[PDB]
Amino acid sequence: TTRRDHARVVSRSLTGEKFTREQASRDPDNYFNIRMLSCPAAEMVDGSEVLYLEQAFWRTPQKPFRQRLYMVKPCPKELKCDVEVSSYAIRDAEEYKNFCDRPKDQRPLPEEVIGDIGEHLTTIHLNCCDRGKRCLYEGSTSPGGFPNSWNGASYCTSDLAVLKNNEIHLWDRGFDENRNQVWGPKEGPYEFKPA
Amino acid sequence: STTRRDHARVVSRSLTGEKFTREQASRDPDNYFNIRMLSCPAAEMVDGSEVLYLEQAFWRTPQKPFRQRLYMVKPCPKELKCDVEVSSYAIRDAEEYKNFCDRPKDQRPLPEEVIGDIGEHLTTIHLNCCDRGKRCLYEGSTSPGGFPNSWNGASYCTSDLAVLKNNEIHLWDRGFDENRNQVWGPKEGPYEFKPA
Q1: C-alpha A55: how far from its chain's center?
Q2: Least packed by Cβ within 10 Å: which of A11, A52, A119, A182?
Q3: B73 vs chain A: nearest CA distance in angstroms?
Q4: Chain A residues near residue B91 by CB distance under 8 angstroms
């Protein structure tokens, strides 16, 4: 299987409707039941697949608290990873609310989506997991960047694992200028499983 | 014959103590969680500001607060027409402050270190004393446009604060992106903190 094949598995695994209900029943102290809803929104010139993804508390599924655009593409031959997943904020997120439940003519078109891509938030390079590992793919935001790159302000980290049967483990955390955690779960990733 | 200094003492007293949003969360669990607020005086300033330490935690993990701040409460300066100024600051090393209110004053950061190790300024609210006939004793909001914030694609944050009788506090902290979409904080209204 090629890196293009791997990227297609990752993008497929990220699409659909998912809940963290099982994890919330197992550890209610630390995790809520969150609904994730995602579907493809555009395709870039370089073959990159662009997914819209939103998260909502299960009791208010039409009021998402997070809205993102994710780009999934095979890692280039020079890099040693398999799949790159990068996330972006949206220019005017209200236009994208419940995107995946609206007809194509009443929601942003793929051309509009390309120009609605906002600030880059995360890049994760995923590797295919070894045989016998629980995951299919796993990766984290890079621990290092170019010299003189950090602007000294709040930053975020992300860990992503893709498991069998379209299960996604996602840990998004934000930190302040002194490396105190300011948002996101403290204990570990949210475990999203299909509805 | 109430001075702005007396008003600031009323606000500081109402903000201290242990509070929960339990009642609001039971009434409207679609939109609000049960959050524990724990606050206590940490320093008194030469200016006259009282400095409060204030943390918030999910009720099931009171030992792992998700937000820890310092709040300076002082009478408004004479040049402004308001009663009380409440400003919030980040803490440099939040770990040194965890469950500050349960630890003894000499076994926790001292007043000189508290003000000295104060982090970035986050919000300022000017509270006004409410007329007779209103539910609140004091109410105020950050001025339009809020203050800079960069959490989760935000560009600014706003804060609404109301003090009610019997130490009830209404607090609405929210972050918004450059295009005025909310990005963090409760969406439907303030959290209603009442004493246990």
Answers
A1: 10
A2: A119
A3: 23
A4: 180
- Please choose, from the candidates B111, B63, B115, B127, the residue with its C-alpha nearest in 3D space to the C-alpha of residue B89: B115
CA distance A50 to A15: 11
List the single residue in B61, B64, B179 with the smallest CB-CB distance to A92: B179
Residue A174 CA to residue B76 CA, distance in Å, equals: 34
Whether B71 and B45 have beta carbons less than 8 Å apart is answered as no
* Greatest CA separation for chain A: 46
Q: A132 vs chain B: nearest CA distance in angstroms?
A: 35
The resolution in angstroms reads: 1.8
Check if the beta carbon of residue B24 is closer than 8 Å to that of residue B37. no
List of long-range contacts for A44-53, beta carbons under 8 Å, 24+ apart: A44/A71, A44/A73, A44/A114, A46/A73, A47/A4, A47/A73, A47/A74, A48/A72, A48/A73, A49/A7, A49/A11, A49/A73, A50/A110, A50/A113, A50/A114, A50/A117, A51/A11, A51/A14, A51/A15, A52/A96, A52/A99, A52/A100, A52/A113, A53/A14
Identify the sign of the CA torsion A14, A194, A59, B66: negative
The burial of B120, by beta-carbon neighbours within 10 Å (0-12 exposed, 13-18 middle, 19 or more buried), is given as middle
List Cβ neighbours of B70 (8 Å cut-off, separation of 6 or more). Answer: B42, B51, B52, B53, B54, B88, B89, B90, B91, B114, B118, B119
* Alpha-carbon torsion, ordered B75, B76, B77, B80, to 10 deg: -160
Method for this entry: X-ray
Residues of A with CB under 8 A from a CB of B: 28-30, 57, 59-60, 63, 65-66, 89, 91-94, 118-119, 121, 153-154, 156, 174, 176-178, 180, 182-183, 186
d(CA A67, CA A87): 10
Q: Which domains are assigned to chain B?
A: 4-195 (2.40.128.590)
